[PDB]
Amino acid sequence: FINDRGIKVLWEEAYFCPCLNPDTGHPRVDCPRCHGKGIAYLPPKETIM
């Protein structure tokens, strides 16, 4: 049922980047893992949803 009514979608999990400032607790403006957002992401997983 789910595979039938769903749409193909890329699922990528979220995790806090190591680049977070240890003292303020807020992220670097630019880094490869996360582009200013304080949360990085894992490789995508193909999924129907």
Partner 1 sequence: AITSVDSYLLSEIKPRLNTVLENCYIIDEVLKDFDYQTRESFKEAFCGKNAQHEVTVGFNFPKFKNNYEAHYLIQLGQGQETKNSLGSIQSSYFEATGDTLVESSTAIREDDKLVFTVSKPIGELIKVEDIEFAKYDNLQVEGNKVSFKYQTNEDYENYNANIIFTEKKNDSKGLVKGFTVEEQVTVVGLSFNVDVARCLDAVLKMILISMRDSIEEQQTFQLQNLSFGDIAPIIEDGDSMIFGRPTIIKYTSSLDLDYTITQDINKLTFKERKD
Residue ranges binding partner 1 (CB under 8 A): 21, 23-24, 26-30, 36-37
Beta bridge partner(s), residue 48: 8
- The DSSP symbol for 12 reads -
36 contact choice in Zn ion, partner 1, none (CB below 5 to 8 Å, kind-dependent): partner 1
The answer on whether 42 is annotated among ligand-binding residues is no
Nearer to partner 1, 36 or 43 (CB): 36
**DSSP structure string for 13-49:** -EEE-TTS-TTT----S--SSSSSSSEEE---EEEE-
Site of interaction with Zn ion (CB under 5 A): 17, 19, 31, 33-34
